[PDB]
Design a protein around this ligand. Structure first.
Ligand SMILES: O=C(Cc1cccc(Cl)c1)Nc1cnccc1-c1ccccc1
Ligand SMILES: O=C(Cc1cccc(Cl)c1)Nc1cnccc1-c1ccccc1
Lengths: 304, 304
């Protein structure tokens, strides 16, 4: 028993982190096979970050201007290209530590682990979620750009996120491994709007099931509700509308506990309308939404 | 910016996890050099866990009864010994992936990362703290025994914890890598008392400094207090007494922010006496105590 914000083991991803230097800018790159992936803003100086013409800036750059380092060994760059907001640096050596991998664009509400890096060196791993407003609330400092977010399936790493930007609001924005930003964000030093961040209702419910499994049952009540009635409460509290797909996804948790999804929805409804009254659920005083039903099942069944 | 419960990258520790089987019991072992370390309760059946005579049970065991597997390769066992509550299995092969390591017994209030494992295979990494009552609040299922807790210093892994037991209260107990339990716990299936768990005051204060650094300043007030007056409030709320050593340790954080330790103590005092009033600090509705001043400085400075 016990329930924690758990990240995937990061070893497979640590073996892919390199340092990319262009001009005076140093950031992280992901080395998979003979390609190093990094944010294209590596070619920018502080001056041109206000309105960069990336295609024009890349024209002033050659393969020898991109300094790629893995640990202490310099990688030789034989090709360079821009794919959306990432640069792909072809090197002459395939990463001997390249794990089985996939590039996937995750859906908002889905979770992933981040290996925060500085100068190609990993410093920490944490679990987070792609917010419904396409931002992530991570821990990133200057130099962390190029740090990746991922999931693991047995031996296969599915890279889903590359860190690029911190908004003036202190939240983080980035891209998938094809360089497409999550959300409406652009890699420019301009005032960008994150948008309203709603609560991932299916995740809160999954965490309420995790709580019941791990003994926390105080919030369970003698009530039930309907999808339409729960969703009236959900809209008032900026929670994602719950669909039948969400209910279906919570099926294994409802079967494991014997608590019907709509009865758990009534508990959540009362928690939203009355608060916690000074109590906690899984050592938290707020409703946690960064555990998918898959994460709860996985954590409660020990999937390696 | 941003502040998360961050764990160390786990790659160095993943390369040490093996599976140890004795009789019908399967658990995790830590392979460093030619030694596999695991909880001695691997020799026990469910029957003798009520009152085991480990020395007597170990007498019925030979090197060939200990099945050690690293990935898919069987390790040959040439020696076995019991050191406190751990067994040391001498194998004929030194772990080629053995990192630079140390065995250290951490102090209560200190933090470490746990790589939760099942059948020698890692499943997740999370950050936790040794509670003042010598328990840890982790996420461990059956099969997780032998999972290790550690810290990393540049390239050196300091192993500090080996998981052994879950108490009926749902909390976790274990040993250092010399097999000495943290706390008064014994590796027996008996009713064991965790003891009163107090809040690590120096860690809450360090997290309040992390909050100020990361923009959350609402809790800062026009007041100050003394060690003796803050400690009167601390005793009432089951918080560890704050000593001058704790104040000294918070020095770099006090210098970084310009907020005197005793002024931060007055903010904490008001937070304890009045609560959060529905507000949050670093996305939490309760005072967080599992970030040491070292963890705050590290996270806010990007130590790799
Ligand atoms: O925000 C940026 C640089 C940037 C700016 C505009 C557009 C882009 Cl694509 C990138 N990167 C960071 C990443 N994560 C966390 C913090 C920072 C950061 C660095 C320096 C000072 C303040 C914050
Ligand atoms: O509690 C034990 C076994 C045990 C019992 C008495 C003494 C010792 Cl040294 C070890 N291990 C577990 C470790 N972490 C989490 C959960 C469990 C667990 C396993 C089976 C059923 C319920 C809980």
């Amino acid at each position: 028993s016990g329930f924690r914000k758990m990240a995937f083991p990061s070893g497979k991803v640590e073996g892919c982190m390199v340092q990319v230097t262009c001009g005076t800018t140093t950031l992280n790159g992901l080395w998979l096979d003979d390609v190093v992936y990094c944010p294209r803003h590596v070619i920018c100086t502080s001056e041109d970050m206000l309105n960069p013409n990336y295609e024009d800036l890349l024209i002033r750059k050659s393969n020898h201007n991109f300094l790629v380092q893995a640990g202490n060994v310099q990688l030789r760059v034989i090709g360079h290209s821009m794919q959306n907001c990432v640069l792909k640096l072809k090197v002459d050596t395939a990463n001997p530590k390249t794990p089985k991998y996939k590039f996937v664009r995750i859906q908002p509400g889905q979770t992933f682990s981040v290996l925060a890096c500085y100068n190609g060196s990993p410093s920490g791993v944490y679990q987070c979620a792609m917010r419904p407003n396409f931002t992530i609330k991570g821990s990133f400092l200057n130099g962390s750009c190029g740090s990746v977010g991922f999931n693991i399936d047995y031996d296969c790493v599915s890279f889903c996120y590359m860190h690029h930007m911190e908004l003036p609001t202190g939240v983080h924005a980035g891209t998938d491994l094809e360089g497409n930003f999550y959300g409406p964000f652009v890699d420019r030093q301009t005032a960008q709007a994150a948008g309203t961040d709603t609560t991932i209702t299916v995740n809160v419910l999954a965490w309420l099931y995790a709580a019941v499994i791990n003994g926390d049952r105080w919030f369970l009540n003698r009530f039930t509700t309907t999808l339409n009635d729960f969703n009236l409460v959900a809209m008032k509290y900026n929670y994602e509308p719950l669909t039948q797909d969400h209910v279906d996804i919570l099926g294994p948790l409802s079967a494991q506990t014997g608590i019907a999804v709509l009865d758990m929805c009534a508990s959540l409804k009362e928690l939203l309308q009355n608060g916690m009254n000074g109590r906690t659920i899984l050592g938290s005083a707020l409703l946690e939404d960064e555990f998918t039903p898959f994460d709860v099942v996985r954590q409660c069944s020990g999937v390696t």
